[PDB]
Amino acid sequence: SHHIRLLQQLDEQRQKDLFCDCHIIVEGQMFKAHRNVLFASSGYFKMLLSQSCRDMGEPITATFDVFSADTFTAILDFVYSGKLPLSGQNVIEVMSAADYLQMTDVIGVCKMFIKSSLD
Amino acid sequence: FSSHHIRLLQQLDEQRQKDLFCDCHIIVEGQMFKAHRNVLFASSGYFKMLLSQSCRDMGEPITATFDVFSADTFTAILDFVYSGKLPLSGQNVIEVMSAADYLQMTDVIGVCKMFIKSSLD
């Protein structure tokens, strides 16, 4: 119960722009999140944020142009909730953006959605 | 229950052990504790109030000092924040619950209250 409650409050912080030390700019859209959460949930951010892992001050700004803003929205919502809204239209786009960000958990969820829909 | 929640909190604890993204230092009984501000803000009413002034300002790590409870008492509480497991026994169940109401942590109080009701029944 503690885990579910904590992540809901962590999701509330990024919505209210609280303790957001990381800015993600995808398709010209701004996304606010926490550095310690992205470092722990994505292999790409583990490498990108490793340089300034102990230095605090200016929020680290990251830019992406390889996936859409709606695709990153479903991925970023999964990080702060554990729920990934998958459908026949975005299952391939989300899974394709997941391996670039090196998120093995998202890839497995998208792969399971395909196996279920195909059966 | 969900694996994503369990996995994330385990990695957050690894960061605090390795002093990664730790923008908050807690000094209790002369012992140094490193942790994250966003995690403490979400798990404690006191830290929600303490970090509310610098919730959007980043820079110098916020240092918090406590002298009303011991370092071993705060260790069990801080470990519960980064794991969800609270080792309770007859020696520290009252000290942890007393320190929980000080930090305004209703979740820790409920665990101690459930631990007392179970042992006596």
Protein model, in words:
The structure is a homodimer. The first copy, chain A, has 119 residues and is of the alpha+beta class. The first copy, chain A, has a single domain, classed as Potassium Channel Kv1.1, Chain A. In chain A, 54% of the residues lie in helices and 13% in strands. Chain A is built from 6 helices and 3 strands; from the N terminus they run αββααβααα. Chain A has helices at 2-15, 35-41, 43-48, 69-79, 91-101, 104-118, and strands spanning 22-26, 29-33, 60-64. Chain A has a 3-stranded mixed β-sheet. In chain A, β1 (22-26) and β2 form a beta hairpin. The longest helix of chain A is centred in the C-terminal third of the chain and has 15 residues, at 104-118. The A-B interface holds A 1-7, 9-10, 12-13, 17-21, 34-37, 39-41, 53-54, 56-59, 78-79, 82, 105 and B 1-9, 11-12, 14-15, 19-23, 36-39, 41-43, 51, 55-56, 58-61, 80, 84, 107. Chain A: It comes from Xenopus laevis.
- Main interface: chain pair and counts: A-B, 33 and 35 residues
Structural class of chain A: alpha+beta
**Name of the CATH class of chain A:** Alpha Beta
Tally of DSSP helical segments of chain A: 6
This entry's quaternary arrangement is homodimer
What does the overall shape of chain A look like?
globular
CATH-scheme architecture of chain A: 2-Layer Sandwich
Name the CATH superfamily assignment of chain A.
Answer: Potassium Channel Kv1.1, Chain A
Strand runs of chain A, count? 3
Helix content of chain A: 40-55%
Head-to-tail CA distance between termini of chain A = 34 Å
Q: From N to C, what is the helix and strand string of chain A?
A: HEEHHEHHH
How would you write the strand order of the largest sheet of chain A? 2-1-3
Largest sheet of chain A: 3 strands, mixed
Number of domains of chain A: 1
